[PDB]
Amino acid sequence: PQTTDAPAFPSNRSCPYQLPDGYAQLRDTPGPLHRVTLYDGRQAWVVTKHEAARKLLGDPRLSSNRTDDNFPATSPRFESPQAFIGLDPPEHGTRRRMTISEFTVKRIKGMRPEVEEVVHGFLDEMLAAGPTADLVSQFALPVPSMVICRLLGVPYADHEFFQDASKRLVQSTDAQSALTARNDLAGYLDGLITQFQTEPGAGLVGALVADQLANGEIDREELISTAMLLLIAGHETTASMTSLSVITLLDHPEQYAALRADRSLVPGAVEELLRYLAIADIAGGRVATADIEVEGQLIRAGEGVIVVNSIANRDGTVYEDPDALDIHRSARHHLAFGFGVHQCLGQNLARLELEVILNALMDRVPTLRLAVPVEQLVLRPGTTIQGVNELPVTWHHHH
Ligand code: HEM
Numbered sequence: 001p002q003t004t005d006a007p008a009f010p011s012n013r014s015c016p017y018q019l020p021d022g023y024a025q026l027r028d029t030p031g032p033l034h035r036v037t038l039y040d041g042r043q044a045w046v047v048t049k050h051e052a053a054r055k056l057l058g059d060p061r062l063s064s065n066r067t068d069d070n071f072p073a074t075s076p077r078f079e080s081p082q083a084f085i086g087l088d089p090p091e092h093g094t095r096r097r098m099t100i101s102e103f104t105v106k107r108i109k110g111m112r113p114e115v116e117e118v119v120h121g122f123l124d125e126m127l128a129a130g131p132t133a134d135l136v137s138q139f140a141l142p143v144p145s146m147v148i149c150r151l152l153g154v155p156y157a158d159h160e161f162f163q164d165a166s167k168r169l170v171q172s173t174d175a176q177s178a179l180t181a182r183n184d185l186a187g188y189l190d191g192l193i194t195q196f197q198t199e200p201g202a203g204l205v206g207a208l209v210a211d212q213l214a215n216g217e218i219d220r221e222e223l224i225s226t227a228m229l230l231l232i233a234g235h236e237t238t239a240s241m242t243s244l245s246v247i248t249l250l251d252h253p254e255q256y257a258a259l260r261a262d263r264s265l266v267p268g269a270v271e272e273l274l275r276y277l278a279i280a281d282i283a284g285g286r287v288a289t290a291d292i293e294v295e296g297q298l299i300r301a302g303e304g305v306i307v308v309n310s311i312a313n314r315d316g317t318v319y320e321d322p323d324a325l326d327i328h329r330s331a332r333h334h335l336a337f338g339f340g341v342h343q344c345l346g347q348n349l350a351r352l353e354l355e356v357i358l359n360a361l362m363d364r365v366p367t368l369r370l371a372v373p374v375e376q377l378v379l380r381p382g383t384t385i386q387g388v389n390e391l392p393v394t395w396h397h398h399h
Helices: 021-028 050-057 093-098 104-129 134-142 142-152 154-172 175-198 204-215 222-251 253-261 264-276 346-364
Strands: 035-036 044-046 285-288 292-296 297-299 304-307 392-394
Touching: 021 175, 021 253, 044 050, 050 292, 050 304, 104 134, 104 346, 134 142, 134 222, 142 154, 142 204, 142 222, 142 346, 154 175, 154 222, 175 204, 175 222, 204 222, 222 253, 222 264, 222 346, 253 346, 264 346
Parallel strands: 044 304
Antiparallel strands: 035 044, 285 304, 292 297
């Protein structure tokens, strides 16, 4: 028999919003941990339950150091200084604190008018041209790209270049392709730094150049890695939430109608979509630097551990009928953004963008529908951020 106690991980979605069959099996199997086999044949642990996931994300013995030989790499792509997503305290905090000013609740509130303007501008163009359109290239991707560009001080004129490079890095299936894409972005950002040294400019990259870099408090290549992380996360991840949210909501028309009828439900719907779609398991990897006993299971020093937030988010002890989309439920404490010192820097920018986008789509494109069957969509594999790379849509064309 072929039966194993260490199934291949990750699994690929066959429905944009449903747990892969293999993940349902992991979810249903008692205990916080399960053994899996990664692409290169190495065994690692996955964390599959909600409280255990929080506990392990909060445990400093589970390091975020991606340079470690034993870090649980899920694809050949995983093969330069790390941005703070790959650092542990105390280094993590010194670098993260260089960027937090741009993501405060006050700044996010100040960004609302800008986000609304950007969203409506891309809708103007799309709706003027008429259906059909690919929602990804025409809306889902450009909106957060334009927003993160202004936040960073990266000129939006270079969007085609950096969007292509970002996709190649995030979705590469080989190390060579990933490395070329990273090199492309690094060289670009290094040029921007030099330009800011000549002519001080706006945006987070400008601020880091004028202050921390000028004071020797961040290495030039660390600034490059940090800007790269924010550029990629700031547009690729939110774009995927948009497209997958549209697909999901169109497959749940009663809930979508209820949402349209009472816009005060939108923040809660955003939480539920984040919980339900949980697009970022690829950011759950950890390596143990010491032995950790977990409800009788032993993680040994040097073992890889992946905190699979998508499965933790379907823990029925926390979310009653966990596989049911319910925009009125308490989706409080979901792990779609992680938990603890590394909890997503951009989480509230993501929440703002999704709220503005859903309200705009309901206002201006109430007749929006998919232009192809859901089954015909091509879903990204579990080795990258979840999503679709194309989303054909149509609507009632008003002249
Ligand atoms: C719905 C969209 C998003 C999702 C689901 C998401 C998910 C996540 C997750 C799960 C983590 C934790 C990684 C870990 O524990 O190792 C994380 C961290 C991070 N995210 Fe996001 N993210 C999103 C959007 C964004 C945006 C818009 C930005 C823009 C700056 C961003 C920037 C970051 C950064 C810088 C970190 C590292 C934080 C740290 O290490 O202290 N993310 N994200």
